[PDB]
Amino acid sequence: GENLYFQHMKHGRVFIIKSYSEDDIHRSIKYNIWCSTEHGNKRLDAAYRSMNGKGPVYLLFSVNGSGHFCGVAEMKSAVDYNTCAGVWSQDKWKGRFDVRWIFVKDVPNSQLRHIRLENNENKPVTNSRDTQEVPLEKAKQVLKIIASYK
């Protein structure tokens, strides 16, 4: 057969999201919210705002050291920088934005480590920092593997 869904799209931007905390992942899935670092929030905010609803901003979530990605969410709002403090495991994050989780499933890094990022020194996508952006052609490949994995 054939799945040409992801291969056919031109307006979308995709970021890696890294979390020290499994609790933060669970809270994000439960309440459809996230918060990054100050520089990560700014990165995500500018991408969401310049997208102006013409395509999705996708977030590929992985807990540091866990060996897998744990799912996919779409950015659903700009960043509100002045929100209740301390709602995450550490009180290091300032602000909040809405997300919508699309896929909650564990995908081993082995499934994705062949895909490399030309904007990050050709390193495997699985070796990315928080809010590392993924070029769209590599992102289509990552999304297809994630959706296919069983």
Query: Would you list which residues are annotated within the binding site?
Result: 18-20, 24, 34-35, 64, 88, 93
d(C-alpha 86, C-alpha 77), whole Å: 20
Residues with Cβ within 8 Å of residue 30, at least 6 apart in sequence: none
Neighbours of 101 (CB within 10 A): 18
How was this structure determined? It was done by X-ray
Tell me the residue type at 55.
Answer: G
Listed by start position, the domains of the chain span 1-150
Quoted resolution (Å): 1.9
Residue with tokens 């997208």: 51
Query: Would you list which residues are annotated within the binding site for RNA?
Result: 18-20, 24, 34-35, 64, 88, 93
What would the DSSP string read from start to end of 83-127?
--S--SSSTT---BEEEEEEEEEEEEGGGTTT-EETTTTTEETTS
Q: CA angle at residue 137 from 142 to 42, to 5 degrees?
A: 85
Asked whether the CA dihedral 82, 85, 18, 69 is positive or negative, the reply is negative
Categorise residue 8: left if φ over 0, alpha if ψ from -120 to 50, beta otherwise.
beta
